[PDB]
Every structure is written in C-alpha cells, then in structure tokens.
Short mmCIF file of all heavy atoms in Angstrom, two decimals:
data_model
loop_
_atom_site.label_atom_id
_atom_site.label_comp_id
_atom_site.label_asym_id
_atom_site.label_seq_id
_atom_site.Cartn_x
_atom_site.Cartn_y
_atom_site.Cartn_z
N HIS G 1 -6.04 12.49 11.07
CA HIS G 1 -5.98 13.52 10.06
C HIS G 1 -7.01 13.27 8.93
O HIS G 1 -7.03 14.05 7.99
CB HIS G 1 -4.57 13.58 9.48
CG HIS G 1 -3.67 14.49 10.26
ND1 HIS G 1 -3.59 14.48 11.63
CD2 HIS G 1 -2.76 15.43 9.88
CE1 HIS G 1 -2.69 15.31 12.08
NE2 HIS G 1 -2.21 15.98 10.98
N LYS G 2 -7.80 12.20 9.00
CA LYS G 2 -8.97 12.00 8.14
C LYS G 2 -8.48 11.95 6.70
O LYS G 2 -9.13 12.44 5.77
CB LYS G 2 -10.01 13.04 8.38
CG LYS G 2 -10.43 12.98 9.85
CD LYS G 2 -11.55 13.93 10.25
CE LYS G 2 -11.69 13.91 11.75
NZ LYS G 2 -12.55 15.01 12.29
N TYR G 3 -7.29 11.37 6.50
CA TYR G 3 -6.84 11.05 5.18
C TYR G 3 -7.65 9.92 4.54
O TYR G 3 -7.75 9.82 3.31
CB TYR G 3 -5.38 10.67 5.20
CG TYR G 3 -4.34 11.78 5.12
CD1 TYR G 3 -4.19 12.71 6.16
CD2 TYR G 3 -3.58 11.90 3.99
CE1 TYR G 3 -3.26 13.74 6.04
CE2 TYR G 3 -2.63 12.95 3.88
CZ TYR G 3 -2.50 13.85 4.95
OH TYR G 3 -1.58 14.92 4.82
N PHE G 4 -8.28 9.06 5.36
CA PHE G 4 -9.16 8.06 4.88
C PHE G 4 -10.47 8.60 4.32
O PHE G 4 -11.25 7.83 3.74
CB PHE G 4 -9.43 7.00 5.94
CG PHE G 4 -8.19 6.33 6.45
CD1 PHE G 4 -7.62 6.75 7.65
CD2 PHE G 4 -7.60 5.35 5.69
CE1 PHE G 4 -6.46 6.15 8.09
CE2 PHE G 4 -6.43 4.72 6.15
CZ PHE G 4 -5.90 5.13 7.34
N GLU G 5 -10.78 9.87 4.56
CA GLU G 5 -11.95 10.49 3.99
C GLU G 5 -11.77 10.70 2.47
O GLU G 5 -12.82 10.71 1.76
CB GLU G 5 -12.23 11.85 4.66
CG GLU G 5 -13.45 11.91 5.58
CD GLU G 5 -13.28 11.31 6.92
OE1 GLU G 5 -12.74 10.19 6.97
OE2 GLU G 5 -13.73 11.87 7.92
N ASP G 6 -10.59 10.73 1.97
CA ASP G 6 -10.36 11.06 0.53
C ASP G 6 -10.27 9.79 -0.31
O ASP G 6 -9.57 8.84 0.06
CB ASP G 6 -9.03 11.84 0.43
CG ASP G 6 -8.62 12.09 -1.00
OD1 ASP G 6 -9.49 11.99 -1.88
OD2 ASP G 6 -7.46 12.31 -1.24
N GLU G 7 -11.04 9.81 -1.37
CA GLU G 7 -11.04 8.66 -2.29
C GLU G 7 -9.74 8.54 -3.00
O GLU G 7 -9.26 7.44 -3.34
CB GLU G 7 -12.22 8.78 -3.29
CG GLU G 7 -11.91 8.37 -4.71
CD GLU G 7 -12.87 9.00 -5.77
OE1 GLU G 7 -14.06 9.15 -5.42
OE2 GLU G 7 -12.44 9.37 -6.87
N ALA G 8 -9.10 9.66 -3.35
CA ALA G 8 -7.77 9.65 -4.02
C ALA G 8 -6.86 8.80 -3.18
O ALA G 8 -6.00 8.09 -3.77
CB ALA G 8 -7.28 11.10 -4.09
N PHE G 9 -6.84 8.93 -1.84
CA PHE G 9 -5.98 8.10 -1.00
C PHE G 9 -6.19 6.64 -1.30
O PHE G 9 -5.21 5.88 -1.44
CB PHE G 9 -6.24 8.39 0.44
CG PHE G 9 -5.07 8.10 1.37
CD1 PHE G 9 -5.06 8.50 2.69
CD2 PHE G 9 -3.98 7.45 0.85
CE1 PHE G 9 -3.99 8.20 3.46
CE2 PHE G 9 -2.87 7.15 1.68
CZ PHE G 9 -2.92 7.50 2.97
N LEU G 10 -7.43 6.22 -1.38
CA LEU G 10 -7.73 4.80 -1.51
C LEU G 10 -7.27 4.25 -2.87
O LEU G 10 -6.77 3.13 -2.95
CB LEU G 10 -9.22 4.57 -1.23
CG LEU G 10 -9.75 4.66 0.18
CD1 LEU G 10 -9.09 5.76 1.12
CD2 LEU G 10 -11.32 4.90 0.24
N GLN G 11 -7.49 5.08 -3.95
CA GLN G 11 -6.85 4.69 -5.19
C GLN G 11 -5.33 4.61 -5.08
O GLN G 11 -4.78 3.70 -5.68
CB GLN G 11 -7.32 5.67 -6.26
CG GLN G 11 -8.10 4.98 -7.41
CD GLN G 11 -9.39 4.30 -6.95
OE1 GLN G 11 -9.90 4.53 -5.86
NE2 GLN G 11 -9.93 3.44 -7.80
N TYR G 12 -4.72 5.51 -4.38
CA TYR G 12 -3.31 5.42 -4.23
C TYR G 12 -2.92 4.18 -3.44
O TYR G 12 -1.82 3.61 -3.71
CB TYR G 12 -2.71 6.64 -3.52
CG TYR G 12 -1.25 6.82 -3.78
CD1 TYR G 12 -0.69 6.38 -4.98
CD2 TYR G 12 -0.38 7.32 -2.83
CE1 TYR G 12 0.72 6.48 -5.21
CE2 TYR G 12 0.96 7.46 -3.00
CZ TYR G 12 1.47 7.06 -4.22
OH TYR G 12 2.84 7.16 -4.46
N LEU G 13 -3.71 3.74 -2.53
CA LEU G 13 -3.53 2.45 -1.84
C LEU G 13 -3.47 1.28 -2.85
O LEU G 13 -2.53 0.47 -2.85
CB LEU G 13 -4.65 2.28 -0.80
CG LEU G 13 -5.26 0.97 -0.25
CD1 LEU G 13 -6.60 1.47 0.37
CD2 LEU G 13 -5.62 -0.18 -1.13
N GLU G 14 -4.47 1.24 -3.73
CA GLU G 14 -4.41 0.20 -4.72
C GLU G 14 -3.20 0.36 -5.57
O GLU G 14 -2.63 -0.61 -6.07
CB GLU G 14 -5.70 0.26 -5.63
CG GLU G 14 -5.60 -0.61 -6.87
CD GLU G 14 -5.04 0.22 -8.03
OE1 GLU G 14 -5.82 0.93 -8.63
OE2 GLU G 14 -3.77 0.11 -8.31
N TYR G 15 -2.76 1.56 -5.81
CA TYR G 15 -1.44 1.73 -6.50
C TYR G 15 -0.33 1.12 -5.71
O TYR G 15 0.67 0.64 -6.32
CB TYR G 15 -1.16 3.21 -6.81
CG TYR G 15 0.03 3.27 -7.74
CD1 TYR G 15 0.05 2.63 -8.91
CD2 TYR G 15 1.16 4.01 -7.37
CE1 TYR G 15 1.14 2.65 -9.77
CE2 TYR G 15 2.28 4.12 -8.21
CZ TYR G 15 2.21 3.41 -9.41
OH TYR G 15 3.30 3.43 -10.24
N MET G 16 -0.43 1.17 -4.38
CA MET G 16 0.55 0.48 -3.53
C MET G 16 0.46 -1.04 -3.75
O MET G 16 1.45 -1.76 -3.43
CB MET G 16 0.35 0.81 -2.03
CG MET G 16 1.33 1.78 -1.50
SD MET G 16 1.99 2.88 -2.79
CE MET G 16 3.27 3.67 -1.83
N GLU G 17 -0.61 -1.53 -4.24
CA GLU G 17 -0.71 -2.98 -4.52
C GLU G 17 0.45 -3.43 -5.47
O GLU G 17 0.78 -4.63 -5.51
CB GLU G 17 -2.03 -3.41 -5.12
CG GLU G 17 -3.29 -3.10 -4.25
CD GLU G 17 -3.29 -3.87 -2.97
OE1 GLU G 17 -2.71 -4.98 -2.88
OE2 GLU G 17 -3.87 -3.31 -2.00
N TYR G 18 0.99 -2.53 -6.30
CA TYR G 18 2.09 -2.93 -7.19
C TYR G 18 3.38 -3.40 -6.37
O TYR G 18 4.19 -4.05 -6.93
CB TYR G 18 2.53 -1.70 -8.05
CG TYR G 18 2.31 -1.88 -9.53
CD1 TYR G 18 1.54 -0.94 -10.24
CD2 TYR G 18 2.84 -2.97 -10.26
CE1 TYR G 18 1.31 -1.08 -11.57
CE2 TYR G 18 2.60 -3.10 -11.56
CZ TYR G 18 1.84 -2.16 -12.27
OH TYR G 18 1.65 -2.29 -13.65
N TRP G 19 3.38 -3.10 -5.10
CA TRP G 19 4.55 -3.41 -4.27
C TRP G 19 4.54 -4.83 -3.76
O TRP G 19 5.52 -5.28 -3.18
CB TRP G 19 4.67 -2.40 -3.11
CG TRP G 19 5.53 -1.29 -3.47
CD1 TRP G 19 6.65 -0.88 -2.76
CD2 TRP G 19 5.45 -0.46 -4.58
NE1 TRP G 19 7.23 0.23 -3.41
CE2 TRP G 19 6.53 0.47 -4.56
CE3 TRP G 19 4.58 -0.34 -5.75
CZ2 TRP G 19 6.76 1.43 -5.54
CZ3 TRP G 19 4.83 0.58 -6.65
CH2 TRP G 19 5.86 1.47 -6.57
N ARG G 20 3.45 -5.53 -3.94
CA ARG G 20 3.33 -6.96 -3.60
C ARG G 20 4.02 -7.85 -4.64
O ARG G 20 4.33 -9.02 -4.38
CB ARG G 20 1.92 -7.33 -3.43
CG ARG G 20 1.31 -6.82 -2.12
CD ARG G 20 -0.10 -7.24 -1.94
NE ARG G 20 -0.40 -7.24 -0.53
CZ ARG G 20 -1.54 -6.92 0.04
NH1 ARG G 20 -2.62 -6.59 -0.73
NH2 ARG G 20 -1.67 -6.97 1.39
N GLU G 21 4.30 -7.32 -5.84
CA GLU G 21 4.87 -8.07 -6.92
C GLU G 21 6.30 -8.51 -6.52
O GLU G 21 7.02 -7.77 -5.84
CB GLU G 21 4.91 -7.19 -8.19
CG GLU G 21 4.57 -7.95 -9.50
CD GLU G 21 3.39 -8.88 -9.44
OE1 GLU G 21 2.46 -8.62 -8.59
OE2 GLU G 21 3.32 -9.90 -10.19
N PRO G 22 6.71 -9.70 -6.97
CA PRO G 22 7.98 -10.28 -6.50
C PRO G 22 9.23 -9.41 -6.64
O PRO G 22 9.96 -9.18 -5.67
CB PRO G 22 8.13 -11.61 -7.27
CG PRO G 22 7.21 -11.39 -8.45
CD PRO G 22 6.07 -10.56 -7.98
N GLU G 23 9.51 -8.95 -7.86
CA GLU G 23 10.70 -8.07 -8.06
C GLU G 23 10.64 -6.84 -7.15
O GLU G 23 11.63 -6.36 -6.63
CB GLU G 23 10.80 -7.65 -9.51
CG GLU G 23 10.08 -8.50 -10.49
CD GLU G 23 8.60 -8.19 -10.54
OE1 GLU G 23 8.00 -7.65 -9.56
OE2 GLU G 23 7.98 -8.45 -11.64
N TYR G 24 9.40 -6.31 -6.93
CA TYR G 24 9.21 -5.15 -6.11
C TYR G 24 9.24 -5.41 -4.66
O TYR G 24 9.93 -4.75 -3.85
CB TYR G 24 7.91 -4.46 -6.49
CG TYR G 24 7.88 -3.86 -7.85
CD1 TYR G 24 7.97 -4.62 -8.99
CD2 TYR G 24 7.75 -2.49 -7.98
CE1 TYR G 24 7.97 -4.08 -10.22
CE2 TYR G 24 7.71 -1.88 -9.28
CZ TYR G 24 7.83 -2.75 -10.39
OH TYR G 24 7.77 -2.16 -11.66
N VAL G 25 8.47 -6.44 -4.18
CA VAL G 25 8.48 -6.85 -2.81
C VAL G 25 9.87 -7.32 -2.34
O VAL G 25 10.17 -7.22 -1.12
CB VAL G 25 7.38 -7.90 -2.55
CG1 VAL G 25 7.82 -9.30 -3.09
CG2 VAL G 25 7.08 -8.03 -1.07
N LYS G 26 10.61 -7.81 -3.28
CA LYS G 26 12.03 -8.20 -2.94
C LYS G 26 12.78 -7.02 -2.27
O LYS G 26 13.70 -7.17 -1.51
CB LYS G 26 12.77 -8.54 -4.23
CG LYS G 26 14.27 -8.97 -4.01
CD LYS G 26 15.14 -8.63 -5.23
CE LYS G 26 16.55 -8.29 -4.75
NZ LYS G 26 17.51 -8.18 -5.90
N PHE G 27 12.29 -5.76 -2.53
CA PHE G 27 12.94 -4.66 -1.96
C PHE G 27 12.34 -4.24 -0.60
O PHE G 27 13.13 -3.72 0.20
CB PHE G 27 12.77 -3.38 -2.92
CG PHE G 27 14.05 -2.69 -3.17
CD1 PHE G 27 14.53 -2.56 -4.53
CD2 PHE G 27 14.84 -2.17 -2.19
CE1 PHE G 27 15.73 -1.91 -4.82
CE2 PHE G 27 16.03 -1.52 -2.46
CZ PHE G 27 16.47 -1.38 -3.74
N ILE G 28 11.08 -4.44 -0.37
CA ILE G 28 10.46 -3.99 0.84
C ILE G 28 11.07 -4.66 2.08
O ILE G 28 11.48 -5.82 2.07
CB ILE G 28 8.91 -4.23 0.85
CG1 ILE G 28 8.56 -5.63 1.22
CG2 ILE G 28 8.31 -3.82 -0.51
CD1 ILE G 28 8.21 -5.85 2.69
N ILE G 29 11.22 -3.90 3.13
CA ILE G 29 12.02 -4.26 4.29
C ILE G 29 11.15 -4.88 5.44
O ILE G 29 11.41 -5.90 5.93
CB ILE G 29 12.79 -3.00 4.81
CG1 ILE G 29 14.08 -2.83 4.03
CG2 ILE G 29 13.00 -3.10 6.28
CD1 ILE G 29 14.54 -1.36 3.96
N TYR G 30 10.08 -4.11 5.75
CA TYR G 30 9.21 -4.52 6.83
C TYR G 30 8.00 -5.27 6.24
O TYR G 30 7.21 -4.60 5.51
CB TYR G 30 8.74 -3.34 7.73
CG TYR G 30 9.96 -2.56 8.22
CD1 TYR G 30 10.37 -1.41 7.57
CD2 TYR G 30 10.63 -3.02 9.37
CE1 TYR G 30 11.44 -0.72 8.05
CE2 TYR G 30 11.70 -2.27 9.85
CZ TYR G 30 12.13 -1.17 9.19
OH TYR G 30 13.24 -0.46 9.69
N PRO G 31 7.79 -6.54 6.55
CA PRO G 31 6.70 -7.26 5.91
C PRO G 31 5.36 -6.73 6.33
O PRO G 31 4.34 -6.78 5.56
CB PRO G 31 6.94 -8.69 6.38
CG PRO G 31 7.66 -8.51 7.66
CD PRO G 31 8.53 -7.35 7.53
N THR G 32 5.21 -6.25 7.58
CA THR G 32 3.98 -5.87 8.17
C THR G 32 3.02 -5.08 7.25
O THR G 32 1.88 -5.39 7.10
CB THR G 32 4.23 -5.04 9.40
OG1 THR G 32 5.23 -5.68 10.20
CG2 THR G 32 2.94 -4.84 10.11
N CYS G 33 3.61 -4.05 6.60
CA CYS G 33 2.89 -3.15 5.77
C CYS G 33 1.96 -3.89 4.89
O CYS G 33 0.74 -3.60 4.78
CB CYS G 33 3.83 -2.36 4.92
SG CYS G 33 5.02 -3.43 4.09
N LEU G 34 2.45 -4.93 4.16
CA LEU G 34 1.62 -5.75 3.25
C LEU G 34 0.29 -6.17 4.02
O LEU G 34 -0.79 -5.79 3.65
CB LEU G 34 2.35 -6.96 2.75
CG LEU G 34 3.54 -6.73 1.83
CD1 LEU G 34 4.83 -6.69 2.62
CD2 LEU G 34 3.60 -7.75 0.71
N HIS G 35 0.49 -6.93 5.09
CA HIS G 35 -0.60 -7.23 5.97
C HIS G 35 -1.44 -6.03 6.42
O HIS G 35 -2.63 -5.95 6.17
CB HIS G 35 -0.05 -7.88 7.22
CG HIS G 35 -1.10 -8.19 8.33
ND1 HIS G 35 -1.26 -7.37 9.40
CD2 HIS G 35 -2.04 -9.15 8.39
CE1 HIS G 35 -2.24 -7.87 10.17
NE2 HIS G 35 -2.70 -8.92 9.59
N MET G 36 -0.76 -5.01 6.92
CA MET G 36 -1.43 -3.71 7.24
C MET G 36 -2.32 -3.24 6.11
O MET G 36 -3.52 -2.97 6.31
CB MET G 36 -0.34 -2.65 7.53
CG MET G 36 0.06 -2.68 8.95
SD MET G 36 -1.24 -3.19 10.00
CE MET G 36 -0.57 -2.89 11.59
N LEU G 37 -1.75 -3.30 4.86
CA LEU G 37 -2.52 -2.87 3.73
C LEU G 37 -3.81 -3.67 3.56
O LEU G 37 -4.94 -3.07 3.46
CB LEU G 37 -1.64 -2.95 2.48
CG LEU G 37 -2.19 -2.90 1.07
CD1 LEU G 37 -3.20 -1.80 0.84
CD2 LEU G 37 -1.06 -2.77 0.12
N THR G 38 -3.74 -5.03 3.58
CA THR G 38 -4.95 -5.75 3.47
C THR G 38 -5.90 -5.48 4.65
O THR G 38 -7.12 -5.51 4.52
CB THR G 38 -4.69 -7.26 3.43
OG1 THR G 38 -3.40 -7.59 3.97
CG2 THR G 38 -4.76 -7.75 1.95
N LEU G 39 -5.31 -5.21 5.79
CA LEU G 39 -6.14 -4.83 6.96
C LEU G 39 -6.92 -3.58 6.73
O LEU G 39 -8.06 -3.38 7.17
CB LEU G 39 -5.26 -4.66 8.24
CG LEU G 39 -5.47 -5.80 9.25
CD1 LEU G 39 -4.97 -7.05 8.62
CD2 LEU G 39 -4.75 -5.47 10.53
N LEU G 40 -6.31 -2.61 6.02
CA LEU G 40 -6.92 -1.31 5.88
C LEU G 40 -8.01 -1.30 4.82
O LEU G 40 -8.76 -0.34 4.75
CB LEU G 40 -5.80 -0.28 5.60
CG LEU G 40 -5.76 0.55 4.28
CD1 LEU G 40 -4.57 1.51 4.47
CD2 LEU G 40 -5.53 -0.31 3.06
N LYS G 41 -8.14 -2.35 4.03
CA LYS G 41 -9.15 -2.43 3.02
C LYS G 41 -10.57 -2.53 3.67
O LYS G 41 -11.57 -2.34 2.91
CB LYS G 41 -8.93 -3.65 2.14
CG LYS G 41 -8.54 -3.27 0.74
CD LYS G 41 -7.55 -4.23 0.20
CE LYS G 41 -7.28 -3.87 -1.25
NZ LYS G 41 -6.28 -4.85 -1.90
#
C-alpha cells in the first residue's frame, strides 16, 4: 500500500520510539515489534 512513501509515516514511526521507554514498554505484549521497528529504519 506504499505507506512507506509518506514522510508523515516515518515521523510517526519515530513517535513510536516513545514505546521503548520502560514504563511504556512494560505494557507492550509482543516484543518483536521493537526489533521490527529498528529493522524498518
């Protein structure tokens, strides 16, 4: 769907970086995403 064409998406990805923080990551269920996120950079 070429969502990676949009720069707004990539800024929102960096906004997803807030989810690596301990109090926040304490909530995340599937660890993969974090790795996935660094993969997608």
Side-chain angles (χ1 to χ4, degrees):
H1 275 44
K2 304 182 187 168
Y3 273 71
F4 300 101
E5 248 79 317
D6 173 22
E7 141 200 324
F9 204 172
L10 285 36
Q11 240 60 16
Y12 199 34
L13 152 199
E14 168 271 279
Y15 189 54
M16 256 29 190
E17 303 295 332
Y18 247 125
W19 267 235
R20 288 180 152 147
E21 219 47 28
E23 340 81 333
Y24 292 65
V25 74
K26 180 211 149 171
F27 232 123
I28 80 95
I29 277 153
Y30 304 98
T32 312
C33 54
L34 293 96
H35 173 259
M36 275 326 189
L37 163 48
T38 23
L39 251 65
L40 118 176
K41 249 143 175 182

